[PDB]
Amino acid sequence: ATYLIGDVHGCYDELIALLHKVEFTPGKDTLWLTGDLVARGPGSLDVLRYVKSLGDSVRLVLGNHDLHLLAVFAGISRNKPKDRLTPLLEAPDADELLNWLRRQPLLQIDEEKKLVMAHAGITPQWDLQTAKECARDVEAVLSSDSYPFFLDAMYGDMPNNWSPELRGLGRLRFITNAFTRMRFCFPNGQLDMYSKESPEEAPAPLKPWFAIPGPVAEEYSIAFGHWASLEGKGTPEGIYALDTGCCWGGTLTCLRWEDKQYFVQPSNR
Ligand SMILES: [Mn+2]
Ligand SMILES: [Mn+2]
């Protein structure tokens, strides 16, 4: 069976309880995770240890909090107390865990399922080939010995409009923002990097990225996390918003792909 779970955010107890609910069995089953494995919840260290141990039985995409953790580890960014990352950062296996984390994808594609996953979704300004090329380019910098320089460059809110002509710092910043921070788009597909509210509460003319017809969404189902204020609701056919806000006192959501059956684990907080 194929199971897809939204943002875990250090909620190790809820993750394990949900996996036990579906009797997740590596070797028989595969788990997809939308990223944001870490921060806010208490168990970021246990989450990363467990997810790394799954190997080929897990398909991860990196989220914005996963990248922030790497930036803190590399001395690029300051540690915020509310993220509760210190047990992980001080762990004796931190190097092992974080060198694994930075090698994981930004994009997962299963052609037999016609299924795409990224943390925030797929901008309507990208076709599949462009999304693949952009994921490869950022995965390449994150996997390299020079990854702290990219982590420092990634912070920024511009450019917010895709073009194949983009180059340099702006190109990687857009790619990072599209995969890991996207929520709202202007009508022409341009990213808005400020509004984090639910679609009904956003100011015009902002619309969800998934409300703008895009070539990937027209051919593939898209699963994503990230947008907790969406509460996993309000999406069109073929769009699966799996982040139901577990670390916020919401729920952790698991979707089984074969029958589109949902399983929910209440927050312990
Ligand atoms: Mn999140
Ligand atoms: Mn996120």
Curated annotation (Swiss-Prot):
One of its GO terms (cellular component) is cytoplasm. Keywords: Hydrolase. It holds the Pfam family Metallophos. It comes from the Bacteria. Co(2+) is a strong stimulator (100-fold increase in rate of hydrolysis). Mn(2+), Cd(2+), Ni(2+), Mg(2+) and Ca(2+) are weak stimulators; the two latter act synergistically with Co(2+). Gene3D superfamilies: 3.60.21.10. It is an enzyme of class 3 (hydrolase). This is Bis(5'-nucleosyl)-tetraphosphatase [symmetrical]. It comes from Escherichia coli (strain K12).
